[PDB]
């Protein structure tokens, strides 16, 4: 992993990042017992392997807020720690891989079209979906699950449309008996995320979008610990007489 | 290590610390290639065990600047990563433990008195000295050195005076082929400290002081990478006709 940044830019970055922190210590009168605790917690983050967690919850929102200024298409959001590459491909209309345990849960049917800025249909266009199960587990992040459970690469047809069936997600709680959750708990916070789909959407000759979609009445909707939920990405699914929840949603892709 | 801080205070602390950083990302337009690099570097700091180094160089100065508001005695400074407790005791006038390799170097003779705010003499009063050798190594931080090389606990007499002989320190360069030094080097900085004595000074019924002393014409004197050098802590040693450098310095101790 490399940035291709200059020493001039880094220097300016670190000066005000360090200036900022050093400024919070002065402003609040941070003591020496406090400093020791802090240092000890940074070691633990590393030792608990919680660096992508902590940063993704607490920092990635600004990185996407920056990228967000540059694009005219669908609203993006943070990737989070759990994306996996080359998930198995599925046809234009499909079901997401899932176990019998998953078959017990109210289904979600997710339809729409991948278009360009003008609104034209895009063939040979892909939707990478992934999200958590009713337990708040992600596959490849819990040994009891099959390695592509609720992950897939959806191949959109002739005109960019896709119809995808999966389950309807339940609120993810981030891990707590570790440094990130001890961080939240010592400040009387809450370790909850909204229920969400993660998606990378692409198509030839387009700047991909990475985003999330959420659910209209959901808990933790206006208190996302990751600060990653927007108005523009909240679905409002209607239920069929089959009893399955139904949503349509379209992705608008910028020029690459 | 425990602070005894409330959730209210921590919450306020983390809000503006996180707000601050998130504010630097927005201000500079930090990209996604940049973010990956950053995250990867935080893992390495941990994995290189460079957390007390990085923080002590870049952060501890504000913690002491805070404590500095509360005290009327000698000017303090940052401890740094290398203090060791219960170094062996020596009488009021002594020499610091050192090898034959150390005996080759111009000697430093360091005299003075530990007093109170009014200026009265303090018996049963201690000076913990430690510092680096002409190589820029600290004992217990390089396997080739004897475990108390240039460390000791000096026992001041009847009236708080001490006379201590050691070597005259050479400029410490912090480690470079690791994350902290790759941090400095990618921004065209310099990994140099001034030459310095570390000292903890105490006496019964007094708030100890932790500080450093530096040398009047030294290199890196106005570009200390740790930002830890003050005007008030720069010695000006005269050389004897024995050829040994001579300094007197007195420590003024606040009520505990
Ligand atoms: C108190 C806790 C610490 C808080 C953090 C404060 C410091 C903030 C700035 C530190 C950023 C250090 C990341 C870059 C250093 C490593 C560069 C490097 O060698 O990576 C190299 C690549 O070389 C580079 O990419 C040059 C460095 C560019 C990266 C700088 C962008 C990261 C800035 C993030 C700032 C976020 C805070 C605002 C990997 O190939 P080897
Ligand atoms: C991008 C990189 C990260 C940058 C850092 C940003 C976050 C800054 C604030 C995080 C401070 C977290 C330290 C306290 C959490 C652990 C508390 C804990 O469980 O320690 C416990 C003790 O419980 C406590 O002490 C309560 C927490 C008090 C410590 C809070 C003071 C540290 C603030 C330092 C802020 C410096 C930046 C300004 C150890 O016993 P078990
Ligand atoms: O499931 C998650 C866990 C932690 C952070 C984010 Cl952004 C997630 O989506
Ligand atoms: O020797 C040192 C190395 C790193 C930081 C400080 Cl403050 C030192 O004194
Ligand atoms: Fe998630
Ligand atoms: Fe030092």
Q: Which residues, 6+ apart, have CB-to-CB distance to A26 below 8 Å?
A: B62, B65, B66
Tokens encoding A162: 């896709």
Tokens encoding A25: 């210590």
Q: How far apart are CA A11 and CA A101, in angstroms?
A: 52
Way it was determined? X-ray
Specify the residue for token string 């900085």. B189
Q: Which residues, 6+ apart, have CB-to-CB distance to A1 below 8 Å?
A: B33, B36, B37, B40
Tokens encoding A57: 């919850």
B182: helix, strand or coil: helix
B193: helix, strand or coil: coil
Q: How far apart are CA A249 and CA A216, in angstroms?
A: 14
For chain B, domain boundaries:
1-71, 72-256
CB atoms within 10 A of CB A47: 12
Task: Kindly state the helix (H) or strand (E) to which residue B198 belongs, with its residue range.
Answer: strand B197-202
Tell me which residue of A184, A76, A219, A194 sits closest to B14, measured CA to CA.
A184
Give yes or no for a contact between B186 and B206, defined as CB atoms under 8 angstroms apart. Answer: no
Furthest CA-CA distance within chain B: 64
Q: Which residues, 6+ apart, have CB-to-CB distance to A255 below 8 Å?
A: A116, A117, A205, A206, A207
Please tell me the distance in Å from A227's CA to the nearest CA on chain B.
Answer: 12
Q: How far apart are CA A62 and CA B147, in angstroms?
A: 48
Q: Which of residues 42-81 of B touch A (CB under 8 A)?
A: 42-43, 45-47, 51-52, 55, 58-63, 65-67
Domain B72-256 maps to which CATH number in 2.40.420.20, 2.60.40.10, 2.60.130.10, 3.40.640.10? 2.60.130.10
Q: How far apart are CA A136 and CA B22, in angstroms?
A: 27
Beta bridge partners of A209: A201
Tokens encoding A236: 């409002």
B190 has a chain A CB within 8 A of its CB: no
Residue B231 has, within 13 A of its CA and on its CB side, a CA count of: 0
Q: How far apart are CA A180 and CA A188, in angstroms?
A: 13
B78 lines ligand 4 (CB under 6 A): yes
Mutate to test the interface with A, among B58, B63, B210 (most CBs of A within 10 A): B63
Q: How far apart are CA A5 and CA A9, in angstroms?
A: 7
Give yes or no for a contact between A206 and A71, defined as CB atoms under 8 angstroms apart. Answer: no
Resolution value (Å, 1 decimal): 2.0
- CA B64 – ligand 2 centroid, Å: 18
Q: How far apart are CA A154 and CA A94, in angstroms?
A: 8
Q: How far apart are CA B254 and CA B74, in angstroms?
A: 9
Give yes or no for a contact between A166 and A127, defined as CB atoms under 8 angstroms apart. Answer: no
Q: Considering only CB atoms, which chain A residues are within 8 Å of B47?
A: 46
- The arrangement of secondary structure in B1-71, i.e. its CATH architecture, is Helix non-globular (6.10)
A107: helix, strand or coil: strand
A47: helix, strand or coil: helix
B218-223: long-range contacts at Cβ-Cβ below 8 A with a sequence spacing of 24 or more?
A: B218/B171, B218/B194, B219/B171, B219/B192, B219/B194, B220/B171, B220/B190, B220/B192, B220/B193, B220/B194, B221/B194, B223/B190, B223/B192
Q: How far apart are CA A16 and CA B30, in angstroms?
A: 13
Residue A38's φ and ψ, nearest 5 degrees, are -55, -50
Beta bridge partners of A201: A127, A209
């Amino acid at each position: 992993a490399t940035a291709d940044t200059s020493p001039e830019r880094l220097a300016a970055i670190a000066k005000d990042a360090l200036g900022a922190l050093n400024d919070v210590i002065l402003k609040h009168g941070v003591t020496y017992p406090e400093y020791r605790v802090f240092k000890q917690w940074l070691i633990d983050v590393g030792e608990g392997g919680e660096w992508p967690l902590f940063l993704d919850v607490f920092i990635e929102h600004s990185v996407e807020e920056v990228l967000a200024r540059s694009r005219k298409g669908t609203m993006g959001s943070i990737e989070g720690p759990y994306y996996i590459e080359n998930s198995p491909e599925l046809p234009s209309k499909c079901t997401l891989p899932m176990r019998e345990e998953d078959e017990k849960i109210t289904p979600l049917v997710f339809s729409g079209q991948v278009t360009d800025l003008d609104g034209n249909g895009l063939a040979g266009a892909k939707v990478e979906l992934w999200h958590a199960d009713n337990d708040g587990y992600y596959s490849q992040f819990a040994p009891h699950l099959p390695e592509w459970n609720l992950r897939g690469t959806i191949i959109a047809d002739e005109e960019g449309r896709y119809e995808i069936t999966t389950i309807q997600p339940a609120p993810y709680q981030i891990p707590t008996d570790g440094p990130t959750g001890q961080f939240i708990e010592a400040q009387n916070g809450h370790p909850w995320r909204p229920a969400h789909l993660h998606l990378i959407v692409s198509a030839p000759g387009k700047e991909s979008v990475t985003t999330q979609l959420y659910f209209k009445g959901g808990e933790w909707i206006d208190s996302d610990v990751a600060s990653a939920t927007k108005p523009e990405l909240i679905l409002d699914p209607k239920t069929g007489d089959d009893g399955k929840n139904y949503v349509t949603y379209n992705f608008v892709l910028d020029p690459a």
